[PDB]
């Protein structure tokens, strides 16, 4: 692998280093092996990073992964965008997927959740628990034909 390291004269230089690529994952055991740099060990399995190194490390790996898909194509998206998506999957304590059983199962608005998937049943179990909808979500105000607290609606205008 190609590595940019500082020379004793100050300037950064190319120092080629031996790296091992593995067809398989067992981070737990491999990092405890001698002769390796356990500070540097990496895997594309962000789940495995999260399980071994914690949620904050998982967030780092998750971004690294999302970024890599975009970069490979040639495209560039500003950091903050992926950072937001990555943080959203991370903030729940673990890894909340962008599926119907991921974010849609979360404690959000009954109307804002039925707008995505499993529409009828989302409302059914909402009627069983007798949920009180905040009506602070975009989707609820969209459905209710009201000016949402989005940009222009984020504040009130007084006389």
């Amino acid at each position: 692998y190609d590595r940019k390291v500082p020379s004793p004269t100050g300037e950064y230089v190319k120092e080629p280093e031996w790296v091992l690529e593995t067809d398989g994952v067992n981070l737990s055991e491999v990092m405890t092996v001698p002769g390796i740099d356990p500070t540097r060990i990496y895997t594309n399995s962000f789940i495995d990073i999260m399980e071994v190194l914690g949620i904050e490390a998982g967030r780092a790996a998750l971004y690294k992964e999302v970024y890599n898909v975009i970069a490979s194509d040639g495209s560039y998206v500003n950091y903050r965008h992926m950072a937001l998506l990555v943080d959203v999957m991370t903030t729940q304590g673990g890894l909340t997927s962008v599926t119907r059983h991921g974010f849609n199962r979360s404690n959000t608005g009954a109307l804002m959740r039925c707008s995505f998937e499993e529409t009828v049943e989302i409302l059914f179990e909402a009627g069983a628990s007798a949920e009180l909808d905040d009506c602070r979500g975009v989707s609820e105000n969209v459905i209710l034909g009201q000016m949402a607290p989005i940009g222009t609606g984020a504040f009130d205008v007084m006389i």
Partner: protein, 168 residues
């Protein structure tokens, strides 16, 4: 070195060089105290959060850390006099311009950043071409990239197609 940051200091400096008709032949009316303390004072007024307490003052300190690293490096006493060759009048204008542009660069509350982020990722994804891998030329570069990879990520796949472990 090259990182996306607010305020283009290079552009401000060159704007002063033209505006104030700076000549690289006349000695500057600046003093060491003017430059050193001027840049020091400018750093105090680069606002993002206006909280009168310890938590928000340290949060504000943290937010501006990197841009100040840039500010210091660009507006050093040697550089201002040796490179730029700015005057007191020109240097003062540069300082006012940075502060104004920085506050102008801050995100406006109400900004639907959620939809912004989603679309910013979603659109380039639709534009993707070789979803398998462009590394197909070599037999030892077999990693699921493009659209199927993004799909594995977003769905939080219990089993990846190409699970790898890069060891250093």
């Amino acid at each position: 070195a090259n990182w996306p940051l607010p305020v283009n200091i290079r552009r401000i400096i060159q704007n002063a060089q033209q505006t104030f008709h700076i000549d690289h032949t006349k000695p500057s009316d600046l003093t060491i105290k003017d430059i050193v303390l001027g840049v020091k004072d400018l750093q105090e007024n680069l606002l993002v959060l206006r909280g009168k307490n310890e938590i928000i003052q340290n949060a504000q300190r943290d937010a501006v850390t990197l841009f100040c690293c840039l500010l210091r490096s660009r507006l050093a006493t040697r550089r201002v006099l040796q490179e730029y060759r700015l005057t007191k009048q020109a240097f003062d204008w540069v300082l006012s311009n940075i502060e104004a542009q920085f506050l102008r660069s801050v995100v406006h509350p109400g900004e639907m950043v959620g939809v912004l982020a989603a679309q910013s990722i979603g659109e380039p994804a639709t534009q993707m071409t070789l979803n398998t891998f462009h590394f197909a030329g070599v037999a030892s570069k077999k990693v699921t990239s493009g659209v199927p990879r993004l799909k594995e990520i977003l769905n939080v796949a219990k089993n990846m197609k190409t699970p790898s472990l890069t060891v250093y």
